[PDB]
Design a protein around this ligand. Structure first.
Ligand SMILES: [Ca+2]
Ligand SMILES: [Ca+2]
Lengths: 111, 112
């Protein structure tokens, strides 16, 4: 199947990412899925543990799976450590999109 | 097949990490874990360069299970806030894999 990641950047800072497809494909897709799940879970964990950042997170396993990490209402969303971890996450997803376009599509939107 | 990661912390800062086994073994469960480890590994290298203004020394090979060592010991800005945050995030991810999949990943943290 396909993983689609949609990032929203507002006033220069990353605020949210929405992913669909994280939950059935060939071997190659299983491997890409593992890479995306790992990066996603490490962002949430590193935000909480290392950047003193409470994340809003919606996740479900239905019809391909859905995940949204949303900092839009989080007080220290524009924090340097927060934004660094988010940028690193964006970098990893972008590299997967570049290396594995058959399995990953990324949209970055400024608002 | 087993991934072994060895982190060295010196005077409070992460200085190096050495990994072996992550090249895969040909077993489904382990290769999913290997994919997780390689993704985090390569993201640390790429994020350090792109986002933390830090070019690492990096040795890598694919022989007998794979070897990788990221070494900041000689880099003058090893102690930088962005550099250490990325490195601690990587340690956090590896440690979480060691917790969740002990049968595939073992970690050593050494404060020498
Ligand atoms: Ca491209
Ligand atoms: Ca334990």
């Amino acid at each position: 199947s396909m993983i689609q990641a949609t990032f929203i950047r507002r006033k220069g800072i990353l605020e949210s990412v929405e992913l669909t497809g994280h939950a059935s494909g060939e071997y190659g897709f299983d491997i890409v899925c593992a890479a995306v799940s790992t990066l996603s879970m490490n962002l949430v964990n590193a935000l909480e543990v290392l950047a003193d950042c409470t994340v809003s997170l919606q996740m479900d396993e239905f019809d391909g799976g859905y995940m949204k990490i949303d900092l839009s209402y989080i007080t220290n969303k524009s924090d340097e450590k927060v934004q660094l971890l988010f940028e690193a996450f964006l970098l990893g997803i972008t590299n997967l999109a570049e290396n594995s376009p058959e399995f990953v599509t990324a949209k970055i939107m400024t608002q």
